[PDB]
Every structure is written in structure tokens, then in C-alpha cells.
Design an enzyme around this catalytic site. Structure first.
Site, PDB file in Angstrom:
ATOM      1  N   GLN A 115      -3.533   5.704   1.565  1.00 11.45           N
ATOM      2  CA  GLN A 115      -3.869   6.033   2.943  1.00 11.45           C
ATOM      3  C   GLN A 115      -2.933   7.111   3.476  1.00 11.45           C
ATOM      4  O   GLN A 115      -1.805   7.281   3.003  1.00 11.45           O
ATOM      5  CB  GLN A 115      -3.834   4.784   3.827  1.00 11.45           C
ATOM      6  CG  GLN A 115      -4.916   3.756   3.484  1.00 11.45           C
ATOM      7  CD  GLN A 115      -4.848   2.520   4.349  1.00 11.45           C
ATOM      8  OE1 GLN A 115      -5.774   2.223   5.099  1.00 11.45           O
ATOM      9  NE2 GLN A 115      -3.756   1.780   4.240  1.00 11.45           N
ATOM     10  N   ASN A 147      -8.477   7.361   5.357  1.00  9.38           N
ATOM     11  CA  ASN A 147      -8.628   7.029   3.948  1.00  9.38           C
ATOM     12  C   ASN A 147      -8.924   8.293   3.144  1.00  9.38           C
ATOM     13  O   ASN A 147      -9.034   9.394   3.691  1.00  9.38           O
ATOM     14  CB  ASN A 147      -9.698   5.955   3.754  1.00  9.38           C
ATOM     15  CG  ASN A 147     -11.107   6.421   4.155  1.00  9.38           C
ATOM     16  OD1 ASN A 147     -11.403   7.617   4.276  1.00  9.38           O
ATOM     17  ND2 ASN A 147     -11.983   5.447   4.364  1.00  9.38           N
ATOM     18  N   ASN A 175       0.825  -1.202   0.000  1.00  5.19           N
ATOM     19  CA  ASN A 175       0.000   0.000   0.000  1.00  5.19           C
ATOM     20  C   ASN A 175       0.862   1.255   0.000  1.00  5.19           C
ATOM     21  O   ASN A 175       1.994   1.260   0.502  1.00  5.19           O
ATOM     22  CB  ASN A 175      -0.959   0.038   1.196  1.00  5.19           C
ATOM     23  CG  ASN A 175      -2.038  -1.028   1.112  1.00  5.19           C
ATOM     24  OD1 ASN A 175      -1.765  -2.179   0.766  1.00  5.19           O
ATOM     25  ND2 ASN A 175      -3.278  -0.642   1.411  1.00  5.19           N
ATOM     26  N   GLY A 209      -3.212 -13.248   6.516  1.00  5.22           N
ATOM     27  CA  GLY A 209      -3.267 -14.492   5.759  1.00  5.22           C
ATOM     28  C   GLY A 209      -1.924 -15.203   5.691  1.00  5.22           C
ATOM     29  O   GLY A 209      -1.858 -16.433   5.742  1.00  5.22           O
ATOM     30  N   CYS A 250      -6.399  -3.384  12.352  1.00  6.84           N
ATOM     31  CA  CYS A 250      -5.338  -3.730  13.291  1.00  6.84           C
ATOM     32  C   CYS A 250      -4.007  -3.937  12.570  1.00  6.84           C
ATOM     33  O   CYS A 250      -3.932  -4.667  11.576  1.00  6.84           O
ATOM     34  CB  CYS A 250      -5.722  -4.987  14.070  1.00  6.84           C
ATOM     35  SG  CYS A 250      -4.673  -5.303  15.529  1.00  6.84           S
ATOM     36  N   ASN A 252      -2.435  -1.871  10.741  1.00  3.61           N
ATOM     37  CA  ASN A 252      -2.333  -1.191   9.462  1.00  3.61           C
ATOM     38  C   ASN A 252      -1.254  -0.126   9.532  1.00  3.61           C
ATOM     39  O   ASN A 252      -1.233   0.675  10.466  1.00  3.61           O
ATOM     40  CB  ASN A 252      -3.686  -0.574   9.113  1.00  3.61           C
ATOM     41  CG  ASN A 252      -3.771  -0.146   7.675  1.00  3.61           C
ATOM     42  OD1 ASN A 252      -2.957  -0.560   6.839  1.00  3.61           O
ATOM     43  ND2 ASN A 252      -4.756   0.691   7.369  1.00  3.61           N
ATOM     44  N   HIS A 260      -9.477 -17.892   9.060  1.00  2.00           N
ATOM     45  CA  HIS A 260      -8.755 -18.337   7.877  1.00  2.00           C
ATOM     46  C   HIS A 260      -8.893 -19.839   7.675  1.00  2.00           C
ATOM     47  O   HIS A 260      -8.907 -20.615   8.639  1.00  2.00           O
ATOM     48  CB  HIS A 260      -7.279 -17.982   7.961  1.00  2.00           C
ATOM     49  CG  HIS A 260      -7.014 -16.525   8.165  1.00  2.00           C
ATOM     50  ND1 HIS A 260      -6.662 -15.683   7.132  1.00  2.00           N
ATOM     51  CD2 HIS A 260      -7.011 -15.768   9.288  1.00  2.00           C
ATOM     52  CE1 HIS A 260      -6.470 -14.466   7.605  1.00  2.00           C
ATOM     53  NE2 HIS A 260      -6.672 -14.490   8.912  1.00  2.00           N
ATOM     54  N   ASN A 268      -9.129 -12.909  12.914  1.00  3.22           N
ATOM     55  CA  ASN A 268     -10.156 -13.152  11.909  1.00  3.22           C
ATOM     56  C   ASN A 268     -10.053 -14.597  11.424  1.00  3.22           C
ATOM     57  O   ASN A 268      -9.052 -15.275  11.700  1.00  3.22           O
ATOM     58  CB  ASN A 268     -10.023 -12.157  10.753  1.00  3.22           C
ATOM     59  CG  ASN A 268      -8.586 -11.937  10.333  1.00  3.22           C
ATOM     60  OD1 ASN A 268      -7.644 -12.414  10.982  1.00  3.22           O
ATOM     61  ND2 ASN A 268      -8.405 -11.215   9.230  1.00  3.22           N
ATOM     62  N   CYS A 325      -2.080  -9.479   2.264  1.00  5.40           N
ATOM     63  CA  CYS A 325      -2.890  -9.705   3.460  1.00  5.40           C
ATOM     64  C   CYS A 325      -1.954 -10.340   4.481  1.00  5.40           C
ATOM     65  O   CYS A 325      -1.708 -11.549   4.428  1.00  5.40           O
ATOM     66  CB  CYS A 325      -4.094 -10.602   3.175  1.00  5.40           C
ATOM     67  SG  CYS A 325      -5.005 -11.149   4.656  1.00  5.40           S
ATOM     68  N   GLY A 326      -1.429  -9.521   5.396  1.00  4.86           N
ATOM     69  CA  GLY A 326      -0.452 -10.022   6.354  1.00  4.86           C
ATOM     70  C   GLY A 326      -1.008 -11.095   7.272  1.00  4.86           C
ATOM     71  O   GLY A 326      -0.319 -12.071   7.595  1.00  4.86           O
TER      72      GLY A 326
END
Ligand SMILES: [Cl-]
Ligand SMILES: [Cl-]
Lengths: 275, 160
Positions: A45, A65, A12, A221, A74, A76, A160, A158, A218-219
Site C-alpha cells: 500500500q 492500493n 503490511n 480481531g 478504518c 489502516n 467477531h 465489524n 487483523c487488529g
């Protein structure tokens, strides 16, 4: 002139501002003005570094944003923030304590100038995922349209579900992704990871995120794929992870221990803008 | 009658750091506003003298309890918010012009004592992270604090 930097991390683009030594107020209007690539600066961002609210922390930082709203995802921007406060001489510490919209973190700047983040301890309890299963196994069977698949599932905060694939380019991300993402056995959907094991310490990975599909980075992930690969007895406790967006390095001594994610942050430019 | 023609009283401010890069944060007596120690220059003293006197009388630290790491080049001014000016007291003081010192505490924490005075302006202290003052200081001092903490950061950061 307000000084700023542009940095790249986790795939990003951040505009990064020192609001410790600079007096500036980021109203949503100012932020949207800054987000405009012809009137302002332009960014994915905006990361604003502020003095801490707590005398035992070193800094606070916020992410906004382009719409001018504060984002609370979290971890980010943590890599760019840590490298930034070091580059600008706001600190000399290697272990930086910082508060964010999501809570407190300790970030470590490695001697290679990568940034290591404590991600917590993974959780394989299916209730915690949440995942429809009677007890936790290192591997699960799931039916997915015509196919049957084997998978590991874990929560990094989250959900996975991670599949071993034989090559991430010859992986039907586009067709298997959505089917497992919202499969019956995930009450809250799940991020679907496709993990090509190259060596015990080197993985290639593509992730079909929860309600977002393919993203370059996606860290969580990467953390999840490595965590199940280790729990399954397939990986060393220190794994390089290759994603479309770049490279992360995961480390984890297994259950009872926290998982560490390490990643780079690129300093792209410095700049000035009058407000 | 130290007040300049502009209405600024000359003042010294003190930033005391320890080895770990924290700074000393002092509570103002009978309040819960915090700040760095600061004090007036008296007739006939230099900046440094006023600083050592304020340091001993308000913090209890002697010349050998600290060393001077740095001081601000020029004076920093702040205007008191209009509501705080005592207009009836001539000559009127509308602000302060300050020289700031960065001190390193070279002896132990027990050498601090905020009751060496019996008219003490501070009744408590703690160590805070270096930038925490820039946020927590009262609004009309923040500009000065930002500039001061900016100027001193390199010196403090070069404490391994
Ligand atoms: Cl980042
Ligand atoms: Cl502030």
C-alpha cells in the site's frame, strides 16, 4: 527526486510519502507506476501524508492500493503514519490529530515509540453484531457441523465470534473457520477468532477473517478476542496479543470505557525516485 | 520603482506562531481568501523594518509583542498568474520576491488588533495548525509556502 520511506506495520508493507513538504499529485497512473517493482518502487500500500483540511487537525493521510484506487479501511496505516511524521520532523507532538477517508483519529506515540489507537467501545448487544440471539451472554453455544462450540461475540465496528482454544497450532482454523464465518446466526458473516490463553495478560491468537480467511494481522480481531476474554472474566485489562504477523497490546477498563490498541511500526528504508 | 529589473516587487511575509505551535492565519479584507500577512518593502527600509511596520499596521503587534525566531536565507519568488498582471501600469510587476520571518507571539492574544489601520488589508484572524496554510493558501503562493513552512518547521518543532 521524490523522497519516500518504506515502513512495515500490522504485517503490511507501506511506501510512505511526505506530500506536506513535497509537491506531488498521486493520479491513479502515477500510483500504478510507483506500485510496479521494476519501473517504480513496489508496495502493498501507498500512504500519502498531506496537510490537514481542518485547522484543528495536524495532518490528513490517504492510502492507495496498487491498482491506484484509494482505500478506506478504518485505522489502516495509522501506526506507520504517526511514527513517520515524527521521524521526518513534520511534528513533535505525541498526540497527533489526523483525518483519513474514514474520519478523524487521535494517535498517541508512546515513549517506547509504539502507536496507540482509540478503537471505540466494544458492543455485545447481538442486534449490533448482528447476531442471532435473544439476549447478550458472556458465552454462547453454537452448533457447527458435527461439533458443539462455546463462544463470545462482540462488535468492534465489524462482527467477531471468539473461541477459546487450547493451542492455536492444534486449532482447526481451516475447518471450523469457514463454518462459523457464514453460520446462520451471523446475518453479515463474522470474523472467527481462535484464542489460546497463555496468561491473564498474554494471548496467542489466529483469526479467520470475514470473507478473507487467514491474514497475518487483523487488529480488530485482537481487539475483539481481548474484549470478550475480559468480558468473560478471563483477562487482565492489559493484554499482549501474539498473532502470526507480530504483537499487539490491547488495553480496556471494561464497559463504559473505550478500548485501546497499541502496535509497532518499523521504519525499513528511505529512498528517492525521479518522476 | 522598488520593482527589480525582472518585475518582482520585494516583499516580506510573516509567520506568527504561539507556544502550542499554531500559526496565525489572516483573512483578507472584504474577501474570504486567507493568508499570512505580507507587505511591500518601502524605499529605504530593510526587510526587518518593513516586517515590523507591516506587523504593527496590519496585525497591531509591536516589537515587544514578538521575537524573531528565524528568517529565510535567500529570497523566495512567485509569479503572479498571467491574468493578474496589470500590464498597462509601468513598470510592470509580474511577481513578488519575499523574505520571510518566523515570529513567536510572546504576549497575549488580546494584543492582536486588525484595526490599528483604517485602510486595513486584513479583517480577521485565527490560529491554525502549522501545516494547514500549505493546503489552504492560494495556488500561486503554495510553492513558496511549502518551502517556507519546511524551513521553519525545525524551529517551531523545537518549542516544547
Ligand atoms: Cl500501520
Ligand atoms: Cl496540498
Amino acid at each position: 527526486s521524490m523522497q519516500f520511506s518504506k515502513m512495515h506495520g500490522l504485517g503490511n508493507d507501506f511506501m510512505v510519502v511526505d506530500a506536506v513538504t513535497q509537491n506531488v499529485f498521486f493520479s491513479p497512473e502515477l500510483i500504478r507506476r510507483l506500485a510496479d517493482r521494476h519501473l517504480g518502487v513496489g508496495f502493498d500500500q501507498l500512504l500519502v501524508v498531506e496537510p490537514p483540511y481542518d485547522p484543528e487537525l495536524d495532518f490528513h493521510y490517504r492510502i492507495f492500493n496498487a491498482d491506484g484506487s484509494e482505500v478506506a479501511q478504518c485505522g489502516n496505516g495509522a501506526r506507520c503514519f504517526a511514527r513517520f511524521v515524527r521521524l521526518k520532523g513534520l511534528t513533535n507532538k505525541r498526540d497527533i490529530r489526523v483525518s483519513t477517508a474514514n474520519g478523524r483519529m487521535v494517535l498517541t506515540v508512546t515513549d517506547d515509540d509504539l502507536v496507540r489507537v482509540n478503537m471505540g467501545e466494544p458492543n455485545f448487544e447481538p442486534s449490533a453484531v448482528p447476531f442471532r440471539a435473544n439476549k447478550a451472554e458472556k458465552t454462547y453455544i453454537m452448533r457447527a457441523a458435527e461439533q458443539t462450540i462455546l463462544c463470545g461475540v462482540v462488535s468492534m465496528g465489524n462482527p467477531h465470534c471468539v473461541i477459546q482454544v487450547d493451542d492455536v497450532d492444534t486449532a482447526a482454523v481451516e475447518t471450523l473457520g469457514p463454518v462459523l464465518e457464514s453460520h446462520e446466526r451471523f446475518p453479515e458473516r463474522a470474523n472467527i477468532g481462535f484464542m489460546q490463553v497463555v496468561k491473564r495478560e498474554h494471548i496467542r491468537l489466529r483469526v479467520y477473517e470475514r470473507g478473507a480467511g487467514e491474514t497475518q494481522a487483523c487488529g480488530s480481531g485482537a481487539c475483539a478476542a481481548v474484549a470478550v476474554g475480559i468480558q468473560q472474566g478471563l483477562l487482565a485489562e492489559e493484554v499482549r496479543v501474539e498473532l502470526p504477523g507480530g504483537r499487539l497490546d490491547i488495553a480496556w477498563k471494561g464497559p463504559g470505557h473505550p478500548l485501546y490498541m497499541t502496535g509497532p511500526a518499523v521504519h525499513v528504508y528511505d529512498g528517492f525516485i525521479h518522476l | 520603482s522598488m520593482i527589480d529589473d525582472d518585475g518582482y516587487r520585494p516583499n516580506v511575509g510573516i509567520v506568527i506562531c504561539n507556544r502550542q505551535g499554531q500559526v496565525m492565519w489572516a483573512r483578507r479584507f472584504g474577501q474570504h481568501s486567507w493568508q499570512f500577512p505580507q507587505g511591500g518593502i518601502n524605499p529605504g527600509e530593510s526587510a526587518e523594518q518593513a516586517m515590523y511596520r507591516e506587523l504593527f499596521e496590519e496585525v497591531g503587534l509591536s516589537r515587544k509583542d514578538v521575537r524573531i525566531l528565524a528568517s529565510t536565507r535567500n529570497w523566495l519568488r512567485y509569479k503572479l498568474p498571467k491574468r493578474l498582471v496589470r500590464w498597462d501600469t509601468k513598470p510592470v510587476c509580474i511577481g513578488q520576491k519575499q523574505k520571510w520571518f518566523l515570529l513567536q507571539l510572546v504576549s497575549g492574544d488580546a494584543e492582536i488588533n486588525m484595526q490599528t489601520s483604517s485602510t486595513p488589508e486584513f479583517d480577521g484572524w485565527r490560529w491554525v495548525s502549522y501545516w494547514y496554510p500549505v493546503r489552504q493558501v492560494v495556488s500561486f503562493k503554495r510553492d513558496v509556502y511549502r518551502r517556507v513552512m519546511k524551513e521553519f518547521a525545525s524551529v517551531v518543532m523545537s518549542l516544547q
